[PDB]
């Protein structure tokens, strides 16, 4: 009836909160309990804790060490009822420390428009699942990040691995068209083409394998290479590269090595050995095959376009400033590929569903069972968003990236500018 015993003292897990403060994760006493207010909206981002309150998931998993904090504990005399009879002197009896609280550079208004958008079009055409990553185009923090199928992480117990999966972070995708405007910038950046020559884009073999667009274009530009997303006017243009010229620049663009975001289970991607590449794979890696990324990754290249030909390493935490990052292109090359881009959103264009009343896009699209993607920034000139969007095996009312994930695209990158409060930079029709 008189009973020693060592009194836990938990320690309060740190609050997940978002860029501007609303609470996102957080702790109760029941023992604690981690309560996520807003449900299923950042199920992926921030993940989920075990039934002992560590990391199991997602960004309660990889911040594990900052955000558990650490256990007091102190030593009582208890009853057989379990009333506490006398605090004991010891050494052990130690007091709490909280955890450390986190900002997100996250924002619920833009996550909410992302996720509500996404779950829209994957049940409009019938998709197996669905991606969005919305990103500062001028700092790399990361805005938005949604997945679909997704899950409840107050009962993750009861959740699919395919709903747990943070698909824009884990998965690796074939580019395709979208990674074009890279292509075409190096090309530019380097000198090998300029802004009036026009090539020879009949379609060719290589060795037994053709090269081919959708339509026969006899010659082009870098725009209409750019605007009709010319497979032949792109494989042109890397092929004024060795193998591992081009193999280098990939790679300096983070494709088949880690991001090391800060994400629990990040793909690496594919980027094959450069020694082993024959010329018609070096081609088809132009217009984005043979080679492989995540949507994250994906976006995140494209800061090299946005951010003045500087590549930005991306954030998940609040940032007071754009992250130092690495020259990729000329700033000249950047600002002339980006005015390039503006005509594919325009009529003649291959992704003219992207096109935002009142702004000028870039974009680019193609479908990656298919992946139908569509990627872009606004105001072209000077972006503040880059949005990208995936949808995975479309099964009704198209198949097309311009036509499944650019509609998506449109409703979230013109929702992001006006929740961002910028303004149009032409009249609205």
């Given amino acids: 009836n008189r009973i020693v015993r060592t009194q836990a003292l938990p320690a309060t897990r740190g609050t997940v909160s978002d860029r501007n403060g ?7 006493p029941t023992e604690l309990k981690r309560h996520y207010p807003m449900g299923n909206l950042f199920a992926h981002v921030i993940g989920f804790t075990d039934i002992d309150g560590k990391g199991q998931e997602g960004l ?9 904090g650490e256990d007091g504990a102190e030593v009582v005399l208890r009853d057989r009822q379990g009333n506490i009879v006398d605090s004991l002197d010891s050494p052990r009896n130690k007091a709490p420390q909280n955890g450390k609280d986190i900002i997100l550079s996250l924002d619920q208004r833009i996550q909410t428009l992302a996720y509500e958008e996404l779950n829209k079009a994957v049940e409009y055409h019938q998709a197996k699942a669905g991606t969005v990553v919305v990103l500062d185009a001028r700092t790399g923090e990361i805005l938005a990040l949604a997945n679909t199928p997704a899950y409840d992480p107050n009962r993750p117990g009861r959740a699919d691995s395919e709903q747990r999966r943070n698909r824009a972070v884990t998965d690796m995708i074939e580019p395709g068209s979208a990674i074009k405007p890279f292509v075409i910038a ?68 983070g494709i088949g090595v880690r991001m090391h975001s800060g994400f629990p289970g990040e793909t690496a991607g594919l980027l094959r050995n450069w020694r082993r590449w024959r010329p018609i794979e070096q081609a088809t890696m132009s217009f984005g095959y043979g080679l492989q990324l995540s949507l994250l990754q994906l976006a995140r290249a494209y800061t090299a376009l946005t951010h003045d030909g500087v590549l930005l390493p991306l954030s998940f935490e609040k940032q007071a400033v754009a992250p130092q990052g ?41 479908t990656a069972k298919h992946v139908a993607t569509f990627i872009g920034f606004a105001p072209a000139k000077n ?47």
Avoid: C, W
């Fill in 383 to 429: 972006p503040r968003v880059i949005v990208a969007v995936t949808i995975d095996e479309p099964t009704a009312h198209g198949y097309y990236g311009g036509v499944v994930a650019g509609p998506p695209f449109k409703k979230i990158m013109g929702g992001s500018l006006n929740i961002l409060g910028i303004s149009p930079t032409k009249p609205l029709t």
């Fill in 326 to 366: 690495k020259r990729i292109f000329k700033e000249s090359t950047a600002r002339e590929v980006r005015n390039l881009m503006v005509s594919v959103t325009e009529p003649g264009g291959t992704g003219t569903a992207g096109a935002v009343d009142g702004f000028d896009v870039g974009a680019k699209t193609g």
């Fill in 186 to 253: 190096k090309a530019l950046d380097a000198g090998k083409t300029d802004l009036n020559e026009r090539l020879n884009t009949q379609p060719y073999k290589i060795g037994p394998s053709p090269v081919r667009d959708t339509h026969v274009y006899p010659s082009l530009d870098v725009r209409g290479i750019m605007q009709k997303s010319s497979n032949v006017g792109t494989s042109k243009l890397s092929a004024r590269f060795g193998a591992e010229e081009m193999y280098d620049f990939y790679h300096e663009l």
């Fill in 60 to 68: 309660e998993l990889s911040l594990e060490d900052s955000l558990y």
């Fill in 22 to 28: 609303a609470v996102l994760a957080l702790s109760a």
